[PDB]
Design a protein around this ligand. Structure first.
Ligand SMILES: [Mg+2]
Ligand SMILES: [Mg+2]
Ligand SMILES: [Mg+2]
Ligand SMILES: [Mg+2]
Ligand SMILES: [Mg+2]
Ligand SMILES: [Mg+2]
Ligand SMILES: [Mg+2]
Ligand SMILES: [Mg+2]
Ligand SMILES: [Mg+2]
Ligand SMILES: [Mg+2]
Lengths: 144, 144
């Protein structure tokens, strides 16, 4: 795991125009958000997730990282511009493909929540959970 | 660290023509080898490291990962073709840049050894140590 940790920490995540380090994730719940500019149900969900994040990410101590299924860089940028959170850089498609496989992401939009420190999965149903609990009263929607 | 571990594990390392996963690193000493096709002292050291690896990587339980300072992809491939070990993919320049910063790699060839499981640094002087101990009798050349 140690080597993997160093390689992971060597990845710079996008933060809008900037790129950032990973310490900022310490002690938070972190979500990977699998979505694409071209996906119609994503287009309906992303605005709700944006609103939920702006309102609750501080108080509920979470971060979101876009894991984009856009393969065109201009579409990737147009879409990420609408988001207030972080992204795996467009160039790191390999990483998105691997995470997609890891979490059995068979459709989008999908939101996978995990403990930043342990790496343990917290929730795989947060896309559907959030639509039913827009206030986040049952956040982080733990599986089972 | 958990998020970083998942991102690291999502990176596929090059293994010659193939790309491989990271479990294969379990319980080994792992070295990052910082070098470039264009570097004259690298050209003199790489053949010795190749010979040392072929002879000892199994019995001394270690792996090597190229962290290339080549910025041209054809030169990167020509050079890596001479190596029997693994590489960070050419496309993952960002990662090489970060690891270079992390381990204060100010010149090449440089060999940085670490425990694969803990991630802890074992040796930062292995380039010079190996030339003086070609049999690896003092492997892994622990610092201080
Ligand atoms: Mg690092
Ligand atoms: Mg914030
Ligand atoms: Mg980008
Ligand atoms: Mg990648
Ligand atoms: Mg979901
Ligand atoms: Mg992974
Ligand atoms: Mg071998
Ligand atoms: Mg490559
Ligand atoms: Mg990279
Ligand atoms: Mg060295």
């Amino acid at each position: 795991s140690g080597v993997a940790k160093h390689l992971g920490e060597a990845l710079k995540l996008r933060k809008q125009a900037d790129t950032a380090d990973m310490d900022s994730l310490s002690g938070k719940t972190v979500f990977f958000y699998f979505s694409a500019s071209w996906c119609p149900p994503c287009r309906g969900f992303t605005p709700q997730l944006v609103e939920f994040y702006e309102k609750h990410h501080d108080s509920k101590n979470f971060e979101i990282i876009l894991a984009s299924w856009d393969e065109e860089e201009d579409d990737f940028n147009a879409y990420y511009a609408k988001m207030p959170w972080l992204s795996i850089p467009f160039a790191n498609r390999n990483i998105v493909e691997a995470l997609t496989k890891k979490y059995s992401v068979e459709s989008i939009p999908t939101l996978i929540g995990l403990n930043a420190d342990t790496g343990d999965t917290v929730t795989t149903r947060a896309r559907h959970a959030l639509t039913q609990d827009p206030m986040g009263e049952q956040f982080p929607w733990r599986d089972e």
